[PDB]
Amino acid sequence: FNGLKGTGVLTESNKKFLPFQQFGRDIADTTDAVRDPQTLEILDITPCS
Amino acid sequence: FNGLKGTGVLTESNKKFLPFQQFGRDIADTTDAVRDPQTLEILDITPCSFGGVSVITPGTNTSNQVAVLYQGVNCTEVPNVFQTRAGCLIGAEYVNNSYECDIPIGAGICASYQTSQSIIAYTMSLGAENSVACSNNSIAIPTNFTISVTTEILPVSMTKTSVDC
Amino acid sequence: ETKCTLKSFTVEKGIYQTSNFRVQPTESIVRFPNITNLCPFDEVFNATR
Amino acid sequence: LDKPEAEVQIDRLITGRLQSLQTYVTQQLIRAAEIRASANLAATKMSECVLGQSKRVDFCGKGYHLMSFPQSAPHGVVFLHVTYVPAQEKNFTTAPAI
Amino acid sequence: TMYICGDSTECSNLLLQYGSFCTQLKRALTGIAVEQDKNTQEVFAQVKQIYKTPPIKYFGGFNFSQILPDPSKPSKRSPIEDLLFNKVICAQKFKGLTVLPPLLTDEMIAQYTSALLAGTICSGWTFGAGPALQIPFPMQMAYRFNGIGVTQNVLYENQKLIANQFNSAIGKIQDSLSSTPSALGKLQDVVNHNAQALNTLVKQLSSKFGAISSVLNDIFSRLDKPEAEVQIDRLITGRLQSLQTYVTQQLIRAAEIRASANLAATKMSECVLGQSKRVDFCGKGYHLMSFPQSAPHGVVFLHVTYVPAQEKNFTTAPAI
Amino acid sequence: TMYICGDSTECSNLLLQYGSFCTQLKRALTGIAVEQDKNTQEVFAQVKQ
Amino acid sequence: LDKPEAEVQIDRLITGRLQSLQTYVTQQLIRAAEIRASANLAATKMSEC
Amino acid sequence: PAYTNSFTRGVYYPDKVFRSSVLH
Ligand SMILES: *[C@@H]1O[C@H](CO)[C@@H](O)[C@H](O)[C@H]1NC(C)=O
Ligand SMILES: *[C@@H]1O[C@H](CO)[C@@H](O)[C@H](O)[C@H]1NC(C)=O
Ligand SMILES: *[C@@H]1O[C@H](CO)[C@@H](O)[C@H](O)[C@H]1NC(C)=O
Ligand SMILES: *[C@@H]1O[C@H](CO)[C@@H](O)[C@H](O)[C@H]1NC(C)=O
Ligand SMILES: *[C@@H]1O[C@H](CO)[C@@H](O)[C@H](O)[C@H]1NC(C)=O
Ligand SMILES: *[C@@H]1O[C@H](CO)[C@@H](O)[C@H](O)[C@H]1NC(C)=O
Ligand SMILES: *[C@@H]1O[C@H](CO)[C@@H](O)[C@H](O)[C@H]1NC(C)=O
Ligand SMILES: *[C@@H]1O[C@H](CO)[C@@H](O)[C@H](O)[C@H]1NC(C)=O
Numbered sequence A: 001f002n003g004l005k006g007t008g009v010l011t012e013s014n015k016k017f018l019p020f021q022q023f024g025r026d027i028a029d030t031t032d033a034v035r036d037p038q039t040l041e042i043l044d045i046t047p048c049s
Numbered sequence B: 001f002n003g004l005k006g007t008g009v010l011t012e013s014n015k016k017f018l019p020f021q022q023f024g025r026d027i028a029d030t031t032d033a034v035r036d037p038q039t040l041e042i043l044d045i046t047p048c049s050f051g052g053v054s055v056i057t058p059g060t061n062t063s064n065q066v067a068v069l070y071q072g073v074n075c076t077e078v079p080n081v082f083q084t085r086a087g088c089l090i091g092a093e094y095v096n097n098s099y100e101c102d103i104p105i106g107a108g109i110c111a112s113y114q115t116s117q118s119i120i121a122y123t124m125s126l127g128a129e130n131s132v133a134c135s136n137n138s139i140a141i142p143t144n145f146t147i148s149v150t151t152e153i154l155p156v157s158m159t160k161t162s163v164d165c
Numbered sequence C: 001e002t003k004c005t006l007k008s009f010t011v012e013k014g015i016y017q018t019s020n021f022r023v024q025p026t027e028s029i030v031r032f033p034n035i036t037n038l039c040p041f042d043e044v045f046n047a048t049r
Numbered sequence D: 001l002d003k004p005e006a007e008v009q010i011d012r013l014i015t016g017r018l019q020s021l022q023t024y025v026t027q028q029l030i031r032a033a034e035i036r037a038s039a040n041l042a043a044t045k046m047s048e049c050v051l052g053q054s055k056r057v058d059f060c061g062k063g064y065h066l067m068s069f070p071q072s073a074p075h076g077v078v079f080l081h082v083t084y085v086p087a088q089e090k091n092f093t094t095a096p097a098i
Numbered sequence E: 001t002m003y004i005c006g007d008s009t010e011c012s013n014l015l016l017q018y019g020s021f022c023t024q025l026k027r028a029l030t031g032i033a034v035e036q037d038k039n040t041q042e043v044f045a046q047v048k049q050i051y052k053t054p055p056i057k058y059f060g061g062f063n064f065s066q067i068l069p070d071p072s073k074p075s076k077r078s079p080i081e082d083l084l085f086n087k088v089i090c091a092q093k094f095k096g097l098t099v100l101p102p103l104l105t106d107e108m109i110a111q112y113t114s115a116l117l118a119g120t121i122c123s124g125w126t127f128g129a130g131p132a133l134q135i136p137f138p139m140q141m142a143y144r145f146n147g148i149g150v151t152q153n154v155l156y157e158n159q160k161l162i163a164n165q166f167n168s169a170i171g172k173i174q175d176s177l178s179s180t181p182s183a184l185g186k187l188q189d190v191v192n193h194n195a196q197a198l199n200t201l202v203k204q205l206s207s208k209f210g211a212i213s214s215v216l217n218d219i220f221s222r223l224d225k226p227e228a229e230v231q232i233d234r235l236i237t238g239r240l241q242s243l244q245t246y247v248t249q250q251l252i253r254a255a256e257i258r259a260s261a262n263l264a265a266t267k268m269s270e271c272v273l274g275q276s277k278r279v280d281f282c283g284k285g286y287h288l289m290s291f292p293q294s295a296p297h298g299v300v301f302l303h304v305t306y307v308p309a310q311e312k313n314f315t316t317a318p319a320i
Numbered sequence F: 001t002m003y004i005c006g007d008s009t010e011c012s013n014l015l016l017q018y019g020s021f022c023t024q025l026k027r028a029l030t031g032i033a034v035e036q037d038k039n040t041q042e043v044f045a046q047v048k049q
Numbered sequence G: 001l002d003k004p005e006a007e008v009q010i011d012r013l014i015t016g017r018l019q020s021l022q023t024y025v026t027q028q029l030i031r032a033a034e035i036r037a038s039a040n041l042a043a044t045k046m047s048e049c
Numbered sequence H: 001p002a003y004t005n006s007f008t009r010g011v012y013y014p015d016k017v018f019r020s021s022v023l024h
Helices: D003-050 E020-044 E106-122 E137-146 E153-157 E159-171 E185-206 E225-272 F021-044 G003-048
Strands: A009-012 A023-025 A031-035 A042-046 B009-012 B023-025 B031-035 B042-046 B053-057 B067-071 B081-083 B087-090 B103-106 B109-114 B118-123 B128-130 B138-155 C014-017 D064-073 D076-093 E049-051 E286-295 E298-306
Touching: B103 C014, B138 D003, D003 D064, D003 D076, D003 E225, D003 G003, E020 E106, E020 E225, E049 E106, E106 E225, E106 E286, E137 E153, E137 E286, E153 E159, E159 E298, E185 E225, E185 E298, E225 E286, E225 E298, E225 G003, F021 G003
Parallel strands: B128 E049
Antiparallel strands: A009 A042, A023 A031, A031 A042, B009 B042, B023 B031, B031 B042, B053 B067, B053 C014, B067 B087, B081 B087, B103 B109, B109 B118, B138 D076, D064 D076, E286 E298
């Protein structure tokens, strides 16, 4: 996503980002949610089993 | 040796190298043998004579005499000489008179400063020699007694500290 | 040596470990295989034609 | 040093001297355990040697325990153990039954 | 310095930038080594009087021949002890890792055990709290029977039965050691743990830890003094923390051994030099007596206990 | 591995150069775990009946 | 970053995180000893009380 | 192409280093 990459399962989130926020992070300062560059959909990122 | 750099003593080897092998390694994957590129002989590589050194001494309040113990080496590789298990001991005179252990060396051997005075080595004693009779018709019964008091000391706490990181 | 090791001018009764000892070799033995396949410059400089 | 590099050597000092602090704490954690075990034994002996009479061999001194008295000390406790010790035995002839 | 760098003088004089780190590691290991020679004194050296073993090994029908030393062997060890000792380095040495001998050799430890056995049989518990006082063995047992709430006449009427049961129980000890997969696992584990802890120590010298090479000399020349040196710090940090970990684990492990040594010393006092009234402390059942035996890096106790049998149901009442 | 390097394929191939640290770690933790199941039987399993 | 540079940065994270895990194991191991001691007491009391 | 079973064949000496009585 815009140069930010990794491995995991993408699902729909129930998070609501402010207009100036592209992505969110967890307590380990690791991205766990991103906004889709085209559809503005917020996706949750969960590691593969 | 043909690019294999190192240091130590080169001796005759009895390692059965294969026709295509140039050097060997120990259990820690460290080179311990090389093939000489001209003679094709195998050279066994060991470290040059070494070992820990300990100084056996009385307090400097009494004397400035010392004895030196070389650990892991006997009395032929070191260059009042006594050979023990711990290693070659030099400067202490070994005597056959036993005493209670003073400055421990190891394997039953201890040292002390005695008579004029010098450092000596001896085998440490275990305790007083005695015996108890076994019999099937005789018993020993105490006719008197004594009250005695002994002192026991135990730690309970230690210094409390804190650090401003 | 013991005094320096213990960082003091007073040494108490007992046995102390100081340091190690070694031979300290100064020679350097360098060995390579004989240079057999000499490069035939003879036909370059000592040519008859 | 210029900032981009100066912070690197500073970072090296921080991790080095930080590891040192860590060694100190680790050793104190182990040393503390040793003191606690001693304190637990001292407390046990207080209960069994001072507040009562023991029947445990060589627990409250060598001999037959009668009583003990506590004394204070820097960073610890000192016990005075009062014991009975038999003396001057004599050889007698004996029998299982009469 | 022999472990981290070796014979490279340009490395040994660089390790000086840390200085006290090697001292702390040396100190910790020294402290442990000293402690190990104390644990064996607390357990075995409980007598200031070293008693000679009895000329005879058959008292009252009880035969202790399998427990007491056997002089026909050069090691003068009892039949059981001689079994325990049979059921339980250059690569390390060349890297600056050495093993130190104990102050008390097996020959000396055996003498303490012999003294304790001699006292237990000829005197009883009295030698553990004063002078040794001779007593007939059958009478020693009579006292030990009263101590468990069984009238002493039971022993005398059944002396032959009791001696026979004892002889059988002792005879079966070797069969429980020589044919059990892990009879001495507790002692072997100590050996295996320290053996592998050391071997996993030397194998870390082959690691690079981010350096271009594990070999100190090969990249001390094939690079600049400014650049190559940057990797000397890397190899030293790696090897230094590897050694630090070894020492830390030994300090923790040593504490576990100390606790065990303290328990062994307590049982020597309460089981062997007396009679215990503590449940399951000196074996299951009603404790009568115990006998010590020597073993590699440890001690073995033989616990003799009384167990009731053949319960019959009687009718009872609080009072008449 | 998941703690260090995570989903990075490149990073996971560098840990191999640091020596068998994960092995020592898993070994130490396993030993602790085994003891935890020992403490409980020593306290409660005082009866064979 | 390219390989010659990324490895320098990545090695800093690996070294640091290895120390974090080592600290956890060391302290977890010390704590296990404390529990073992109380377990031995509990077993003794089960027997004697 | 009558595919067969390679079993445990195809192992070779990976290096020119002498080793003995050891697992590598
Ligand atoms: C040193 O020796 C003197 C005797 O000359 C003695 O009085 C003093 O107490 C000793 N001091 C120590 C620390 O042994
Ligand atoms: C000293 O050690 C060497 C090497 O093992 C051995 O050859 C020599 O015979 C030993 N000498 C003595 C007196 O032990
Ligand atoms: C001790 O006695 C032995 C004989 O058993 C003798 O060979 C030895 O030289 C004596 N040693 C000393 C220091 O007197
Ligand atoms: C017992 O010993 C004491 C000395 O402490 C002595 O005065 C007393 O007379 C002795 N009694 C007997 C019966 O020997
Ligand atoms: C040349 O090298 C061979 C080894 O391949 C050796 O056997 C032979 O002696 C060498 N010749 C000379 C003159 O050293
Ligand atoms: C008792 O007899 C033994 C010999 O069996 C002897 O060694 C001991 O000294 C005697 N004790 C007394 C008080 O006479
Ligand atoms: C004592 O037991 C041993 C077997 O360990 C036996 O050989 C010996 O004969 C027995 N002693 C007697 C007097 O029967
Ligand atoms: C005693 O009575 C109980 C029942 O109260 C029975 O289970 C047990 O087997 C009996 N024991 C004997 C020896 O008769």
